[PDB]
Write a sequence for this structure.
C-alpha cells in the first residue's frame, strides 16, 4: 500500500482533545508492551509537544481469549472525521444479513495496519499511555497507518477488501458478507459444520492475502432472534388489582395501537373495592379484552426505518438477571424489541450484565441496520463510567445517556 | 572540543490564520535603556538572542524592572500578545503525583537544570515571531532589534518544550537504571534510590555523565534544602508526608473570601486530617460573588469550624505506599450528606484520607450516597495506586443485597466487607410487591386550581372511611402527595394505597430516605412506621371506581 488517501476533518472543526481516563497498572503494562511492538513494526510513532490532540485508550480481552487487545475510543474523532463516500456514493446495507440462519463475526481490524495513514491526518490520532499517579509523563504516540476503530479505516480499506473477497464471493454467491468497522459479518444458511469450515476458508483467504485475533469467530443466529409482542394475562379469576394493572397496561398500549379500549374493563371497577377482591368478568369486558388481545397480535403501523435519524435503544432492569429493551427512532414506533436473561457472567454484578446487554443490542443494530443506536441506560453516570470498560469486549463503542427517573413502563414489558 | 549531541528542535506554528505580533515598544528612560543594552549584550554573547535587520515586521515590547535588595535592573519581554497567537501544546504537567502513591527512597538528590534550559534551541522558522526592540538613547538612532534563539521565559511553549526535551534526553538513562527514580518539575531534577549513599552518589555522577553528552552542566541544587522538601504544598519527609502547616485564622468577622480560603485549606487538609467537614461552611457561600460581603455563621457552621479546629490541633501524617501489602478503604457516614474515608495498608497508618459530599438534589438516600463515595474512592485509587482498594463499609451484606436486587437501576460496588461502625447505612422502608390481604384499601387523589391555588386532597376506602381536606396556596403535585400522606396518617400498620399520580410514583419508586420537601419527608416518616405498604398506580380519568369517586371529591 503506497499512496495515502487524503483525509480531512469537517469544516471548522479541530481534532479531538479528550482526556485519558485513569487506567489500572495491569492495563498500563499491557498497553506498554503492545505499543512497544507496534512502534517496532512502524504502526505508531512517538510524538512531541507540538501535538495537542488526544483520544483515550484502554485495553480489553475479546470474548474467550487471554491476550490483551488495545482499544482506542475514537468516538470523538469519528464524529469530527469528514463523512466518507469511499469510491461510490454508498454501500447499501444488506437487508438479507438479518435473515441468514447463521452469522459469524470476524475481527479483521488487523488488515488495516498494512495501509499508511495520510501523513497530514496522523496528528489527529494522538493518544497517551498514562503513568500511575502522574509519576512520569504519559507516553505519547500517533498512528502511521489505518487505526482499528476509526471510521475512515473501513472506508479507505474498502477497495482493498472487495478484491480479497471477490474470489470467495465469486465462489459462494449466497453467503452474505457485511463489514462494520473492524468486523466482518459472514452469514450462510448452511450447516454450522460446513459454516465453520467455510468461515475458516475465508480466514485463510485473508491469511494468504496478508493477525492477533483473526482466529476468533463470534457466532450468531439472527434467524432465531425472537421479539417481544405485548401480552395480556389469561386468568380464570381477576382481582381488583389484576384489572387495575390490566387497564394501566392497555392504556399505555393504546398510545402504540389504535382501537384499544378499556371502557368495559374499567366498568368492572365500580365502587371502592378491596384490591384483593375477585371480580368476575362480564361478557362485555371479556369481549373487550378479546378485541384488545387481537389488536395486539398485529404489528404496529407505519413503522419504517429512516436512515437519516438516530436509532434509540432503551433498556430496563427486570430483576433476576433479566433485561428488556426497545429500539426506535420515534417514540411508540418500535423497530425491534427484545428480552435477555442469564447473562454469561455476573449473577451478582448488575453492571456487567448491563454492559453485555449493551454489546448484544449494538450487535443486533449493526446486523439489522448497519449502525449503532444511542442508549438510554438505567444507571447513574458515575457508576457506569467507573466500571463499563472492565467488561467491554467489542472493538466499537456506541453512545449512551443516563435515565435518572424510574420509568413507570418497566412493568409493561414485565 | 568534546562533540555534544544537538537537542532536537520542536517544530512550532502560530494558530491557523493568525500572524505574529506587532506591538509598539513603549518609551523608556535613558537609565532603563542603558540597563537593557548591557543585559542584551551579555545574552547575545551567550547565544540566547541575535541582532536582526529591519525587514522583520514583528515586535514584542520589552521592559526594565528593579528589585528590593538586588539593585540590578532585570529585563522583561511581554509575550502576552505572542502567546495569544501561538498554537496549543501538549502540557505534560497537569497533575502531580500524590505523596500517598509514592514509595520510600533511602536517598534523594536534587539537581538544578535551569542552566541546561538554555541549551534547548527554538525552532528556527519561529524565531522571527519573538523579535523585540531596545529603543535608542534620545531616539536618535534606530532601535536595537533582537530575536530569540532559545526558549524565551514567559513564552507559551517554553514549559512543555523544555520538559519534553529533558524527558527524551533522560529516557535511556531511566530505562537502563531501573533501580532509581527521576522526577522533573520546573528547574528541578529529583533523583531517588534505595542504593547506599556512596553507590547512589555514583549514579548521580553517571547522570551528569549522561547529561553532558548534550553539553548540559548540572551541579547539586545550591543550599541543598534540609528535609522535608517543600513541594506542591506538601511536606515530603523521609518516612512520612503531610500538608504544610494548616493554620485556621481566628476571626470575629467572616467574609466571602475568608470562607472560600477556609474551605480551600480544609479541603487541602482533608487529604490527611480525617473527618474534616465543610458542608455548613461551604453552605454559606451559596450564590454570592462579592468576596468582600460579610456573612454571619450559622450556629451549625461555628460548631463545624470549631470541630475542624480540634482536628487541626495536632498535626497528622500519612505513610508511603508498600506494593506488597493490601490496599484498604474505609468509609463513615457523617450526616447531612457528608462522608469521610481512610485508605490504609496497616490499621492506624493512613496512606491518605478524604471526604465526599452528596450531589445537589431534591430527594436522596444513604445507600445511593455510599455508592457514589465508593465510586469516587475507586477512581482516586486507580489514579494514585493503579488498583481498586478493598472496601470496609458500614452497611450489612444483607442490606446491600436487598437494595441492589430490588433497585430499578443497575448498580455495583466492588469487593467489600461490612464494618460494624455506627451509624450504619440501612433501608428505611420497603414497599410490598403484591396487594396485602386484609389491609384496608385507600383510593387517594388531590387537585388544585391553577389560578386561585386552592386545592383539595383526600381518600375513600373500601371500609367507607373518607376524608377531604381543603388546602390553600397549593398545586396539583402537592395535593397528590398530600393525599398519600393523609392515607398513611389515617391507616393501620398495613395499607394498600391506590393513586393516579405519576409524579408521586416517580418520587417514591426512587426510594428516598430524605428530602428537601417537608411533605415528602413526612411521607417517608410515615412509611418508616408502617409494617406493610402496597402502592398501586392507575391511570387518571378512566372510570376506575374509588379513583373516580375521590377525583370528583377533590376537583371541587
Ligand atoms: C524525587 C521526587 C521528589 C519530590 C520532591 N520534593 C517529588 C516527587 C514526586 C519525586 O519523585 C518521586 N518520588 C518518589 N518517592 C518519594 C518518597 C518520599 N521522599 C521524601 C524524601 C526522601 C528522602 C530524603 S533524604 N533521606 O535523602 O534526605 C528526603 C526526602 C522523596 C521520594 N518515588 C518516585 C517514583 C517515580 S518518580 C518519584
Ligand atoms: Mg384526579
Ligand atoms: Na430517617
Amino acid at each position: 500500500p503506497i499512496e495515502t488517501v487524503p483525509v480531512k476533518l469537517k469544516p471548522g472543526m479541530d481534532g479531538p482533545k479528550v482526556k485519558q481516563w485513569p487506567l489500572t497498572e495491569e492495563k498500563i503494562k499491557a498497553l506498554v508492551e503492545i505499543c512497544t511492538e507496534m512502534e517496532k513494526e512502524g504502526k505508531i510513532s512517538k510524538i512531541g509537544p507540538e501535538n495537542p490532540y488526544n483520544t483515550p485508550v484502554f485495553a480489553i480481552k475479546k470474548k474467550d481469549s487471554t491476550k490483551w487487545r488495545k482499544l482506542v475510543d475514537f468516538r470523538e474523532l469519528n464524529k469530527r472525521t469528514q463523512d466518507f463516500w469511499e469510491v461510490q456514493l454508498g454501500i447499501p446495507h444488506p437487508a438479507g444479513l438479518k435473515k441468514k440462519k447463521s452469522v459469524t463475526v470476524l475481527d479483521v481490524g488487523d488488515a488495516y495496519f498494512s495501509v499508511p495513514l495520510d501523513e497530514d491526518f496522523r496528528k489527529y490520532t494522538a493518544f497517551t499511555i498514562p503513568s500511575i499517579n502522574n509519576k512520569t509523563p504519559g507516553i505519547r504516540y500517533q498512528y502511521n497507518v489505518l487505526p482499528q476503530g476509526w471510521k475512515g479505516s473501513p472506508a479507505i480499506f474498502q477497495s482493498s477488501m472487495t478484491k480479497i473477497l471477490e474470489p470467495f464471493k465469486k465462489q459462494n454467491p449466497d453467503i452474505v458478507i457485511y463489514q462494520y468497522m473492524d468486523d466482518l459479518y459472514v452469514g450462510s444458511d448452511l450447516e454450522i459444520g460446513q459454516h465453520r469450515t467455510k468461515i475458516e476458508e475465508l480466514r485463510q483467504h485473508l491469511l494468504r492475502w496478508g493477525p492477533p485475533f483473526l482466529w476468533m469467530g463470534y457466532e450468531l443466529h439472527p434467524d432465531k432472534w425472537t421479539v417481544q409482542p405485548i401480552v395480556l394475562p389469561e386468568k380464570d379469576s381477576w382481582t381488583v388489582n389484576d384489572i387495575q394493572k390490566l387497564v394501566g397496561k392497555l392504556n399505555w398500549a393504546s398510545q402504540i395501537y389504535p382501537g384499544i379500549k378499556v371502557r368495559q374493563l374499567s366498568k368492572l371497577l365500580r365502587g371502592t373495592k378491596a384490591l384483593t377482591e375477585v371480580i368476575p368478568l362480564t361478557e362485555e369486558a371479556e369481549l373487550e379484552l378479546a378485541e384488545n388481545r387481537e389488536i395486539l397480535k398485529e404489528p404496529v403501523h407505519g413503522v419504517y426505518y429512516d436512515p437519516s435519524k438516530d436509532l434509540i435503544a432503551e433498556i430496563q432492569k427486570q430483576g433476576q438477571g433479566q433485561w428488556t429493551y426497545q429500539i426506535y427512532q420515534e417514540p411508540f414506533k418500535n423497530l425491534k424489541t427484545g428480552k435477555y436473561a442469564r447473562m454469561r457472567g455476573a449473577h451478582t454484578n448488575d453492571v456487567k450484565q448491563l454492559t453485555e446487554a449493551v454489546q448484544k443490542i449494538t450487535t443486533e443494530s449493526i446486523v439489522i441496520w448497519g449502525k449503532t443506536p444511542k442508549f438510554k441506560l438505567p444507571i447513574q453516570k458515575e457508576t457506569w463510567e467507573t466500571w463499563w470498560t472492565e467488561y467491554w469486549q467489542a472493538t466499537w463503542i456506541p453512545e449512551w445517556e443516563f435515565v435518572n427517573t424510574p420509568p413507570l413502563v418497566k412493568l409493561w414489558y414485565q | 572540543m568534546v562533540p555534544i549531541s544537538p537537542i532536537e528542535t520542536v517544530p512550532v506554528k502560530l494558530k491557523p490564520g493568525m500572524d505574529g505580533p506587532k506591538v509598539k515598544q513603549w518609551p523608556l528612560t535613558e537609565e532603563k535603556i542603558k540597563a537593557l543594552v548591557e543585559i542584551c549584550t551579555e545574552m547575545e554573547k551567550e547565544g540566547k538572542i541575535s541582532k536582526i535587520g529591519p525587514e522583520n515586521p514583528y515586535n514584542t515590547p520589552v521592559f526594565a524592572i528593579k528589585k528590593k535588595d538586588s539593585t540590578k535592573w532585570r529585563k522583561l519581554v511581554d509575550f502576552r500578545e505572542l502567546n495569544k497567537r501561538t498554537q496549543d501544546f501538549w502540557e505534560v504537567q497537569l497533575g502531580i503525583p500524590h505523596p500517598a502513591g509514592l514509595k520510600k527512597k533511602k536517598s534523594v538528590t536534587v539537581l538544578d537544570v535551569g542552566d541546561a534550559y538554555f541549551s534547548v534551541p527554538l525552532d528556527e522558522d519561529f524565531r522571527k515571531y519573538t523579535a523585540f526592540t531596545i529603543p535608542s538613547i534620545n531616539n536618535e538612532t534606530p532601535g536595537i532589534r533582537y530575536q530569540y534563539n532559545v526558549l524565551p521565559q514567559g513564552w507559551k511553549g517554553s514549559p512543555a518544550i523544555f520538559q519534553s526535551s529533558m524527558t527524551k534526553i533522560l529516557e535511556p538513562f531511566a530505562a537502563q537504571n531501573p533501580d532509581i527514580v527521576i522526577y522533573q518539575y520546573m528547574d528541578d531534577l529529583y533523583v531517588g534510590s534505595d542504593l547506599e549513599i556512596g553507590q547512589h552518589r555514583t549514579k548521580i555522577e553517571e547522570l551528569r555523565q549522561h547529561l553532558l553528552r548534550w553539553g548540559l552542566t548540572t551541579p547539586d541544587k545550591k543550599h541543598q534544602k534540609e528535609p522535608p522538601f517543600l513541594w506542591m504544598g506538601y511536606e515530603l519527609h523521609p518516612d512520612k508526608w503531610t500538608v504544610q502547616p494548616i493554620v485556621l485564622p481566628e476571626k470575629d468577622s467572616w467574609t466571602v473570601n475568608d470562607i472560600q480560603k477556609l474551605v480551600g485549606k480544609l479541603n487541602w487538609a482533608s487529604q490527611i486530617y480525617p473527618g474534616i467537614k465543610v458542608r455548613q461552611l461551604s453552605k454559606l457561600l451559596r450564590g454570592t460573588k462579592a468576596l468582600t460581603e460579610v456573612i454571619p455563621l450559622t450556629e451549625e457552621a461555628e460548631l463545624e469550624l470549631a470541630e475542624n479546629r480540634e482536628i487541626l490541633k495536632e498535626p497528622v501524617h500519612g505513610v508511603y505506599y508498600d506494593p506488597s501489602k493490601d490496599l484498604i478503604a474505609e468509609i463513615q457516614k457523617q450526616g447531612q450528606g457528608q462522608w469521610t474515608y481512610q485508605i490504609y495498608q496497616e490499621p492506624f497508618k493512613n496512606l491518605k484520607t478524604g471526604k465526599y459530599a452528596r450531589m445537589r438534589g431534591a430527594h436522596t438516600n444513604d445507600v445511593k450516597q455510599l455508592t457514589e463515595a465508593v465510586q469516587k474512592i475507586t477512581t482516586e485509587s486507580i489514579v494514585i495506586w493503579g488498583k481498586t482498594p478493598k472496601f470496609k463499609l458500614p452497611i450489612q451484606k444483607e442490606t446491600w443485597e436487598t437494595w441492589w436486587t430490588e433497585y430499578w437501576q443497575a448498580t455495583w460496588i466492588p469487593e467489600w466487607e461490612f464494618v460494624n461502625t455506627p451509624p450504619l447505612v440501612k433501608l428505611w422502608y420497603q414497599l410490598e410487591k403484591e396487594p396485602i390481604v386484609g389491609a384496608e384499601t385507600f383510593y387517594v387523589d388531590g387537585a388544585a386550581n391553577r389560578e386561585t391555588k386552592l386545592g383539595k386532597a383526600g381518600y375513600v376506602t373500601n371500609k367507607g372511611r373518607q376524608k377531604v381536606v381543603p388546602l390553600t396556596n397549593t398545586t396539583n403535585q402537592k395535593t397528590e402527595l398530600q393525599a398519600i400522606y393523609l392515607a398513611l396518617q389515617d391507616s393501620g400498620l398495613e395499607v394498600n394505597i391506590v393513586t393516579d399520580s405519576q409524579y408521586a410514583l416517580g418520587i417514591i419508586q426512587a426510594q428516598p430516605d430524605k428530602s428537601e420537601s417537608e411533605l415528602v419527608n413526612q411521607i417517608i416518616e410515615q412509611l418508616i412506621k408502617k409494617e406493610k405498604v402496597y402502592l398501586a398506580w392507575v391511570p387518571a380519568h378512566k372510570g376506575i371506581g374509588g379513583n373516580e369517586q375521590v377525583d370528583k371529591l377533590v376537583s371541587a
About this structure: The pocket of K5A (ligand 1) is lined by residues A 135; B 97, 102-105, 107-108, 181, 183, 190, 192, 227, 229, 231, 236, 238, 320 (CB under 6 Å). The domain at 96-120+162-219 of chain A is CATH 3.30.70.270 (Alpha-Beta Plaits). The longest helix of chain A spans residues 152-171. Chain A touches chain B through 64 residues (CB under 8 Å).
